[PDB]
Design a protein around this ligand. Sequence first.
Ligand SMILES: NC(=O)c1ccc[n+]([C@@H]2O[C@H](COP(=O)([O-])OP(=O)(O)OC[C@H]3O[C@@H](n4cnc5c(N)ncnc54)[C@H](O)[C@@H]3O)[C@@H](O)[C@H]2O)c1
Ligand SMILES: NC(=O)c1ccc[n+]([C@@H]2O[C@H](COP(=O)([O-])OP(=O)(O)OC[C@H]3O[C@@H](n4cnc5c(N)ncnc54)[C@H](O)[C@@H]3O)[C@@H](O)[C@H]2O)c1
Ligand SMILES: [Cl-]
Ligand SMILES: [Cl-]
Ligand SMILES: [Mg+2]
Ligand SMILES: [Zn+2]
Ligand SMILES: [Zn+2]
Ligand SMILES: [Zn+2]
Ligand SMILES: [Zn+2]
Lengths: 377, 377
Amino acid sequence: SETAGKPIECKAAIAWEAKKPLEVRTVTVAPPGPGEVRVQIKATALCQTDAYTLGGLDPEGRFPCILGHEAAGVVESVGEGVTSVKPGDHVIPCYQAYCGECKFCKHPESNLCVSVRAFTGKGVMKSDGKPRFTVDGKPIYHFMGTSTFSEYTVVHEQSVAKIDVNAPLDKVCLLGCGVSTGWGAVFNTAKVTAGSTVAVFGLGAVGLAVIEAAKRAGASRIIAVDIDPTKFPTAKEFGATDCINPKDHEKPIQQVIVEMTEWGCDYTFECIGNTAVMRAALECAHRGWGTSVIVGVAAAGQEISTRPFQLVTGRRWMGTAFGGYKSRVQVPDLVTDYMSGATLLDKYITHNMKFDQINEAFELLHAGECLRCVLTF
Amino acid sequence: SETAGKPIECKAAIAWEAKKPLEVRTVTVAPPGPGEVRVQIKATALCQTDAYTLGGLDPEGRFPCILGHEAAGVVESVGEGVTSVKPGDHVIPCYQAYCGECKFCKHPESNLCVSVRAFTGKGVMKSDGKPRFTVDGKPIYHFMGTSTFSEYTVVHEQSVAKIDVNAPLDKVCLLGCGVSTGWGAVFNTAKVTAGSTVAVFGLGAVGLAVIEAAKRAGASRIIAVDIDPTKFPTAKEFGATDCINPKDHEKPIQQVIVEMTEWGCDYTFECIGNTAVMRAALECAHRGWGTSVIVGVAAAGQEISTRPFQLVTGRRWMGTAFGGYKSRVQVPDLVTDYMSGATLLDKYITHNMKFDQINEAFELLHAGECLRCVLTF
Ligand SMILES: NC(=O)c1ccc[n+]([C@@H]2O[C@H](COP(=O)([O-])OP(=O)(O)OC[C@H]3O[C@@H](n4cnc5c(N)ncnc54)[C@H](O)[C@@H]3O)[C@@H](O)[C@H]2O)c1
Ligand SMILES: NC(=O)c1ccc[n+]([C@@H]2O[C@H](COP(=O)([O-])OP(=O)(O)OC[C@H]3O[C@@H](n4cnc5c(N)ncnc54)[C@H](O)[C@@H]3O)[C@@H](O)[C@H]2O)c1
Ligand SMILES: [Cl-]
Ligand SMILES: [Cl-]
Ligand SMILES: [Mg+2]
Ligand SMILES: [Zn+2]
Ligand SMILES: [Zn+2]
Ligand SMILES: [Zn+2]
Ligand SMILES: [Zn+2]
């Protein structure tokens, strides 16, 4: 290789501080240490989670840092000990790691690996406790263990899903977070049964993925809820049978849903990050057995509340992280399902832009005018 | 019966108004109307739910009424169209009805029948909207559809479980309330798996039932929690492996439980009715997959709260009503199970008193060190 074992200077987008636009400039990327993989990002999308940390809403937010966590790329080089990937492998770096040996990797119902979170949560690497990015010798920190807003990033081996080398990297970049989360919320967390009724709160890429998955699960009714009705036509494309704007009703939205379904929907999904809506989604879960799945990420500190009578009379409050998918094991399975022609993944990409316009993409998502914006270098 | 078709003069305990003692006196019990059943009560227990309504705290409280909801007895006569029981059958009347045709009776994960609940909640019968008790020709209202503090009571057919004629009625009287509820919270709601860890908050009859069922399910560790340490010895006999008094510790009790189990317990149960402790039970459920079952009934105007991060990181919040048991279907199975010698049901009866002493029995309940006290006439 031409770059293996040596630093790489490449284009990236740095967040020097919160609530400021990113600076697209050159950074230096160190070679991978033991158990690490240096990846050449080929495509990367913006998620609402990136704007969440950029807006100062992350308690563990550490600046300066390279954001980004929805990407697909090619292995440029690996550090010593790395056996699972090799240069040339097509990969998807995942915020959720997989070690196969911790208690959560071994449990059938969890994907919350603890192999590297103590370091990825701090924006550093496990091998030496430091980051791999510098600018004029000063350290720039990692984000969600991925930091995909850079031509080359360095990640832990446990965070690297090896995927079908023939899958288009600018489409499956979405499988690193949002769309996978919405799908697994249906298939893994809720396990929607055929015939069921569903309510989805928030119609971004995540909520639309809940709708697509619930459709595929055989749901007989899917109520799409959003305060922005310009997202309704796409929601009906994915399979929504009803679209509801909360601002068209003086009743609370959970009362509206209950009246449409007498007792509530068998499953409800919150895909916003609004604690008042999370409460609403649980209270319009069906009496006796309804399930509500929190998908959105609320601002740190905020609390959800309900009357305990809601759970005593049969409703179930749960949440999901990355759809319950064990990353390195199951992300390749999602790529395989994409390559089989069975998904609507291509429909989630509303804009393809160059990496230099990353800030316009952030304005697109703050304005609700995009689903997923895929950046290429 | 030579009482069939006729009113019956029998002894009962009348609650004329709130916060005053019951009067033990004769009452007139009308014959059973269409779809109604008249039961000779052979044994009836007390619990805190009776004392809650008697104390004037119940917003649905209706006086004068006849309290009592834990009982077993024999059918004296049946009203028009009743075929599920006949005179002489041994029965348990249940607050939780089963009609076998509404949405909830037909769902495998619910037992919240709506056949008669709107009428029992108002202390009247469904056939005509009127009660069946009179003193001096003026009406006495029912309680929880059972009104078991009476030698004879009239109940809806949907509330009448038909049980093994061989079962002792002064023991199976408990199967209509807290013991079944705690058992079912484990077997039906949580579905506690073999080898799992369990935490129980509150060590009355309900929590002790949770402990007994969890041990029977194969739980490898059972942590009993109560601010009254005098409940610990009995918690250990039912199968507790640890006992924790929250007041002995200077950290939040959920942090105590998590430190004892590194990540939390696989299952936790709130058996008190305390929203603060409900949140504590949720937050010491195991990371990634822990389940917390609210069993206790909180006071009015109280809400449960947590940070949604707790659910996004894999914890599940649910509740139970009557342990999820479909009453007329499954209460007979609980009796059969008790007759098999598999349960500690007899160990929940700490006191046996005569019905004339009902007021003294209530004072024992208010003092404590009484799990269940059974009254016979
Ligand atoms: N649990 C996880 O692992 C995970 C993974 C990825 C994303 N998320 C979170 O899920 C959420 C959705 O992600 P996204 O990319 O689709 O964001 P998005 O901004 O593209 O979509 C959110 C939608 O919610 C709508 N909305 C806002 N407030 C509303 C309200 N009161 N009522 C109804 N609709 C409302 C908005 O109009 C918007 O269309 C985000 O909070 C994200 O952080 C969680
Ligand atoms: N879901 C149902 O269908 C159903 C059925 C029956 C009873 N319940 C409810 O279950 C609950 C328990 O029933 P019970 O008969 O055992 O009542 P109980 O009063 O006999 O037992 C309550 C126990 O909780 C302990 N306790 C009180 N506050 C505590 C605290 N902060 N921390 C730890 N322990 C505390 C008390 O010391 C006591 O031992 C009640 O709320 C009851 O209404 C529900
Ligand atoms: Cl938080
Ligand atoms: Cl799919
Ligand atoms: Mg993720
Ligand atoms: Zn792991
Ligand atoms: Zn994301
Ligand atoms: Zn009771
Ligand atoms: Zn019913």
